[PDB]
């Protein structure tokens, strides 16, 4: 509700007035120095900061600045002073316009006590034209207390939804996280969907993101869909929420294609083959006119700006960043007094940096594609200084940090096509500008005393047309059947990455069945599972993991890996087709071992 | 949280 509000602080109580703020329309406007970023609560709902002018001393809660009224030189204003422990009083004066060093500002020569800082300044019209900007005491001397406010904004903020529901229409939402968000926009469109009685699907990249949607949509009739279920259908006003990989593995497994006519994919830039595949299908369903869909992303496929916009200002520092352990030179890493996010190209690389900064006495959390859904909640819960992470953190991973150290690198999987066909982990090579923009994205979403900093190294590379994922999604995609007998294609811009012809990867009969199984139960990469299945090898049959050249022998910690089979024999792990991803990290390999023995 | 609100006033010019 609109008006004037006192700002009380306690814990342990405590209870003293720090300043005054103004709620107008639906947004709260007070001084920066009063809250300094701290959250607020009242009779209904908490308040999150989104806009703040650091030096200019003013902050906005629940969207950008809203106060649209200006003072004019030589006039008459009214400071509605809300003294701490005292009743509101209007104070009128003739406000002087004095010289600063930037230019010229208007102010009032009035003195009120600390904890009044942020009282409204009212014009003859009645609309608030500024805030009581302490201070005070400017040279020279006495006062003066500045008439402090920003320029009209614009946009910022705040709704309402365009009719993006009309079938055969696809929308990209260049959502800015920090303004709100899956907090404000997603329930808003979901609500509107139910009113239009549309078969709705929400697609969230990780599980823990979907879990964050679940609560952001508490009350709403929404059912999470376990991937261990081929299809679920209740036949009532219900919104399915699932992981991207759930959607595609369902489209693969079950023949019961539910005819959603609305599909909202959050973080639609995920280049995981499952996600690419999903985007492929959903796109074709839009084309059918059988569906309309929304793709939420800060960096839509195609986008190449490594420095997009943010709701909070980011400093972009370019430096040298270590790849192994360090000693001297790189003190700025350690010297920093705040929470940091660090992107490493691989899990192995991760372990160095951690071990190295662990010596400095820094509480570091490690993140990888597997450990993520088990390690990310710890970044909220426990106290820490450094989260080292792989590029998994590009998918809606929200951290409360101030710095991202991003050596701008990664490993990309590649299929070499000379003699034997195999997948290797190329690099570390430079990331995509999109992926850079995304890593940087983690930072600079909360207004902060110091602007958040993106500390990077090197220029990204656009071309990833040899990435396995694209051709891996093609084989994923064109093994999903449709009731209209149409072959699904890669989604628009993403098409130009695959040089393959449409459908060529199609697997007939119950080879197709194996290909699904290998991915779903045996838990193998798409390329691998494809080559094994299309060889007519049954899912139980494992004796292919032992027929390779000298070259194909898998290694673990510099030693030949030798496994104990189901029928019981020690055999050197030597796949026919070599896919690097199965041994790229211990847990992957550990898991592949279990498969190869027959215990899966 | 540790900060709170208390509605003390409404915005209007004194005629």
From TrEMBL, chain A:
Residues 1-160 form the Peptidase S7 domain. The active site is at 33 (charge relay system), 57 (charge relay system), 117 (charge relay system). It is found in: Host cytoplasm, Host perinuclear region; Host endoplasmic reticulum membrane; Host mitochondrion; Host nucleus. Component of the viral RNA replication complex that functions in virion assembly and antagonizes the host immune response. Residues 313-494 form the Helicase C-terminal domain. Homodimer; in the endoplasmic reticulum and Golgi. Interacts with protein prM. Interacts with non-structural protein 1. Interacts (via N-terminus) with serine protease NS3. It comes from the Viruses. The chain holds residues 1493 to 2092 of 3387 of the full protein. Residues 162-318 form the Helicase ATP-binding domain. This is Genome polyprotein. It comes from Dengue virus type 4.
Automatic annotation (TrEMBL), chain B:
It comes from the Viruses. Coiled coil: none annotated. This is Partial polyprotein for NS2a and NS2b, type 4 prototype DV4 H241. It comes from Dengue virus type 4 (DENV-4). The lineage of its organism: Viruses, Riboviria, Orthornavirae, Kitrinoviricota, Flasuviricetes.
